[PDB]
Design a binder for this molecule. Structure first.
Ligand SMILES: Cc1c(N)cncc1-c1cc2cc(Nc3cc4n(n3)CC(=O)N(C)CC4)ncc2c(N)c1F
Ligand SMILES: CNC(=O)c1c(C(N)=O)nc2n1[C@H]1C[C@H](C1)c1ccc(C#C[C@]3(O)CCN(C)C3=O)cc1-2
Ligand code: NA
Lengths: 290, 291
């Protein structure tokens, strides 16, 4: 790929500190040596006997993605078999990091977050791209209180596996149509991000998604049973009917009836006036006071 | 561990390798003869390393040793020696139905009806054990010297099991995951009824010596099955086949998995329940092969 910078990222950036994990790779905070601007660098090591398809898909996803509510992609450096993905810096970290200090968010704060994530998802889905990993840990906040979607590692893995299973599909002349549809289209569509956002709205309201106490495998099994009920907000009178309805429609069980991102953006909870980053600046102020 | 019952010895202590089978189609399968008794077996060799992931093989052997049925190829055990695993199975002199019809030509309706009944019995057993074959085809249906029909090649089935095992060990935190995504993660997006469709295609293969659309690009064929107006394939020669055979093709090739009948249900279909079906039809096929 000619877009890759074939040089050492330390040519341009002072590495400052490790910021955490992600779906794969280590993320570093760094500073532009010329402008003094801050960035984050997701470093992915490519070891000798490694399939790099997932990494290549991640770069492919980001190369054509330009939307304010998606963490900006500035490019990638390949050096000493390490790929450094350079991106926009969001100084406050993830919402999950934040609410573990501040406590649960207010309804207006959640409404701003949901509106901003929905704007990002509409753009992503308009590119036939899926996030598939929406949660508080993947919603980043910068010092201005603005909302950014991050970590496409899961998205990239899904696209690489789909391309791989397709390349190694062999002769499908005996294959049933439902198997073929799964091989080409994966078994679901972008509306899974709308459900995840509804669960995130509960997360931000209650500091954990439903059934977080339950073993992950057990949770998978419960969601596939006939009696599975979409979760609800635990405290009824704490939240408006608009918030309850938002949760109800985003958590529609059938994907055939789950509304799209663009449709959800006309929902009154996220289309109401007065939603601005200042609501999140207030949250960041709670952080600043222990 | 690949299998607690592995024989930690070289199978060539006991067998002489006589010839490779499949010409690469079946992989490294070998006709082998017992050095002492002269009994013939099939040894399928798979190369192993320390770094090699053994999950698929482990699943394949688990399937073979736990799914003993009259219509599944017989499994005699596995040898591990010098980074080579050998799967020992019964030897079928005639090979697969594809081997046979490339010599004999198209099978008769009764012979195809008998194969379908026997395969459905094996599938009904497999599905009853929460197993999916997912690669039913003429090349994977063996005919032994006694004229018995036996499903084989559980490699795709093993792969599917190994993918599910890896998704669940690395499931992470699925608390934000949508129900339809959890269903695909857990159940794969389809069910054992895909095998019923594959048998319908196989019945056409045994009658015409090619599956429908064999001359169309594989990726093109895949896409067509996802288009709303996909018409399931039919038998070419209408006049050659009975109404029951056409209807059997119709029902197995129900494109909606919600309406496709199960293996046990399909066994009460008029075609595969008719009294004229007996092993002699296949022995007759073997007699034709021998001539
Ligand atoms: C079908 C198959 C798959 N798909 C994958 N892995 C193994 C087998 C598999 C093949 C067998 C083949 C034979 N015997 C014959 C006889 C002939 N062939 N093979 C082909 C050939 O080479 N000739 C020259 C024609 C006659 N016996 C037992 C087998 C067995 N137990 C298997 F599991
Ligand atoms: C103060 N700040 C951060 O703690 C930050 C930023 C930050 N920018 O500030 N990022 C992370 N963290 C931490 C660590 C972890 C959360 C993480 C994990 C994965 C990704 C990613 C990614 C991409 O797939 C590649 C490029 N791109 C636009 C993606 O989405 C970013 C981050
Ligand atoms: Na072979």
């Amino acid at each position: 790929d000619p877009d890759i910078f074939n040089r050492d990222p330390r040519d341009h950036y002072d590495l400052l500190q490790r910021l955490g994990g992600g779906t794969y790779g280590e993320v570093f905070k760094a500073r532009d040596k010329v402008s003094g601007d801050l960035v984050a660098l997701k470093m992915v090591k490519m070891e000798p006997d490694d399939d790099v398809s997932t990494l290549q898909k991640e770069i492919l996803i980001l190369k054509t993605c330009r939307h304010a509510n998606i963490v900006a992609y500035h490019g990638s450096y390949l050096w000493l078999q390490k790929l450094w993905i350079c991106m926009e810096f969001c100084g406050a970290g993830s919402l999950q990091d934040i609410y573990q200090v501040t406590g649960s968010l207010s309804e207006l704060q959640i409404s701003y977050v949901c509106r901003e994530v929905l704007q990002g998802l509409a753009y992503l889905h308009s590119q036939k791209k899926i996030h598939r990993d929406i949660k508080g840990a993947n919603i980043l906040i910068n010092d201005a209180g603005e909302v950014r979607l991050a970590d496409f590692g899961i998205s990239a893995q899904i696209g690489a596996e789909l391309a791989r299973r397709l390349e190694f599909i062999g002769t499908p002349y005996w294959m049933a149509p439902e198997v073929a549809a799964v091989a080409l289209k994966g078994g679901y569509n972008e509306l899974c991000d709308i459900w995840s956002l509804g669960i995130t709205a509960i997360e931000l309201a209650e500091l954990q998604p439903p059934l977080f106490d339950v073993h992950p495998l057990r949770v998978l099994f419960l969601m596939t049973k006939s009696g599975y009920q979409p979760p609800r907000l635990k405290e009824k009178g704490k939240w408006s009917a608009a918030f309850h309805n938002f949760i109800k429609v985003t958590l529609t069980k059938s994907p055939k009836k789950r509304p799209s991102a663009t449709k959800m953006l006309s929902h009154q909870l996220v289309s109401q006036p007065g939603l601005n980053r200042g609501l999140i600046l207030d949250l960041l102020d709670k952080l600043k006071n222990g």
